[PDB]
């Protein structure tokens, strides 16, 4: 993006001042759309010395004579040339600037425009910058951030000591990673993305995307009228144990609710009987085990079962002990079908197996599972899209790293999912998503496409729950999937 500004100025010939004018007026229009008529509000515009501040001077200048009061607090030392030009315009237009900030200054204003730092933030915020941000955060005023809330690193979404909490953020061209990943996603408040005149070619060249409704709509598989269940594929789910009898049921129904033609579960006897007593549409094959867990004794039956399917999901509720490790790794090594690898199958996975497989795989860890898989801490892997990309690329797989914002990558293309709510922060949620992904693969979507559509729909179904999200359970999530699908179309 600063690349995209650079090219638009130096190669396309757009004056930097024209980009900055367009940025500032976008902020004014955005605020009007959110607050209604601006003429009754008093504005405090906080401007740094850089281009974000310059954008702020444009805002301030365009509000002059049209709103109740505007004051700029200039917080920088030096001014970049465009900031200086726009400062000069603000003052020529009769605008007032002060350079000292007084704690009681918030009292006489209704709206704070935060133009302190944009994408040029380097290092922790301290001093008067911090004191001022902390005062704005305690003020209860309406806060509109220019580009990114000051204090958010726009590459990672991390807070650099302290950051503005905005009601509205207006960003330019494309959303930044810092609006998409937490905590930055939370501090952004409502995000508007403004067109400030970059060539469309440069906007579309970005390689990291937010999954949108239109993207998912266009990926949904067709349902030709002259069809039968075989048209819509077959899934095998290898799942469950004497300890975890529920997981298979949720995965299997996740596949059926997204349109899959046939779903077979392989589950240890008698736990397999649990699935059909709840959903008799499922096929739940009884696997005879020594002690209630899959082991190498079951390798051959599972491979036979896999021959008549298009995709295999493995892992939910398997347990994690040595015989399961041996089974999972020997199975995946021999299986010549796409695999969706989740939960306990991740916890015992030998990643060498993934390198040697000719067939594709999708892995769906939460950060605790990812952390154990790459031998790092949760803090080092959480929202670490570059680590996810490296892992996907090295192991020839799709990685779906689950969290409130989910990252979906094959190492070349990375997508971010922002649907969902905290009702998914509960056992069983993950098991449903596993079945969904397998189901869409069976219907003919690529592993990456299936993962993209599934994470979106899974989160969207959650948002459709009619009561308080904390009461959402996986069973109700399932009931909501076909409504998410209908609403998407």
């Amino acid at each position: 993006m600063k690349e995209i500004d650079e090219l638009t100025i130096k190669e396309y010939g757009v004056d930097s001042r024209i980009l900055m004018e367009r940025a500032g007026i976008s902020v004014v229009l955005a605020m009007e759309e959110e607050l209604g008529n601006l003429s009754d509000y008093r504005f405090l515009v906080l401007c740094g010395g850089g281009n974000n501040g310059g954008d702020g001077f444009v805002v301030a200048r365009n509000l002059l004579g049209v709103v109740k009061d505007v004051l700029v607090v200039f917080l920088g030392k030096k001014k970049t040339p465009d900031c200086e030009y726009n400062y000069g315009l603000y003052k020529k237009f009769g605008g007032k600037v002060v350079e000292q900030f007084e704690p009681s200054i918030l009292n006489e204003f209704d709206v704070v425009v935060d133009a302190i730092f944009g994408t040029g933030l380097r290092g922790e915020i301290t001093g008067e910058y911090a004191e001022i941000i902390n005062l704005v955060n305690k003020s209860g005023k309406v806060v509109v951030s220019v580009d990114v809330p000051s204090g958010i690193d726009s590459n990672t979404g991390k807070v650099l000591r302290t950051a503005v909490k905005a009601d509205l953020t207006v960003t330019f061209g494309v959303p930044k990673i810092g609006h998409i990943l937490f905590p930055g996603r939370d501090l952004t408040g409502k995000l508007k993305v403004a067109n400030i005149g970059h060539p469309v070619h440069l906007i579309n060249s970005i390689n990291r995307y937010v999954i949108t409704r239109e993207m998912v709509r266009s990926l949904l598989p067709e349902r030709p009228r002259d069809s039968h269940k075989g048209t819509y594929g077959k899934v095998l789910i290898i799942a469950g144990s004497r300890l975890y009898s529920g997981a298979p049921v949720l995965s299997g129904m996740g596949s059926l609710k997204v349109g899959t033609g046939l779903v077979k579960l392989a589950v240890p006897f008698p736990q397999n009987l649990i699935a059909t007593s709840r959903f008799p549409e499922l096929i739940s094959v009884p696997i005879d085990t020594e002690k209630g867990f899959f082991s190498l004794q079951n390798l051959q039956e599972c491979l036979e079962l896999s021959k008549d399917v298009d995709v295999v999901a493995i892992g939910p509720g398997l347990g994690n002990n040595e015989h399961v490790r041996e089974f999972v790794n020997e199975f995946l090594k021999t299986l010549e079908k796409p695999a969706v690898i989740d939960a306990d199958a991740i916890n015992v996975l030998d990643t060498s197996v993934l390198k040697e497989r000719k067939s594709p795989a999708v892995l769906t860890p939460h950060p605790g599972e990812m952390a154990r898989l790459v031998k790092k801490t949760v803090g080092d892997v959480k929202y670490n899209y570059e680590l996810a990309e490296e892992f996907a690329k090295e192991n020839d797989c799709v990685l779906v790293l689950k969290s409130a914002t989910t990252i979906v990558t094959d190492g070349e293309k990375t997508l971010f999912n922002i649907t969902g709510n905290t009702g998914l922060s509960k056992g069983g949620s993950g098991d449903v998503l596993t079945g969904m992904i397998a189901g869409f693969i069976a219907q003919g979507l690529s592993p990456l496409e299936a993962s993209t559509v599934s994470v979106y729909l899974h989160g969207f179904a959650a948002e459709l729950f009619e009561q308080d999200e904390r009461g959402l359970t996986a069973s109700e999530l399932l009931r909501l999937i076909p409504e998410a699908i209908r609403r998407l179309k």
Binding site: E33, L191, N195
Partner: peptide
């Protein structure tokens, strides 16, 4: 109408 703003 979406010339100016995407959300």
């Amino acid at each position: 109408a979406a010339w100016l703003f995407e959300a």
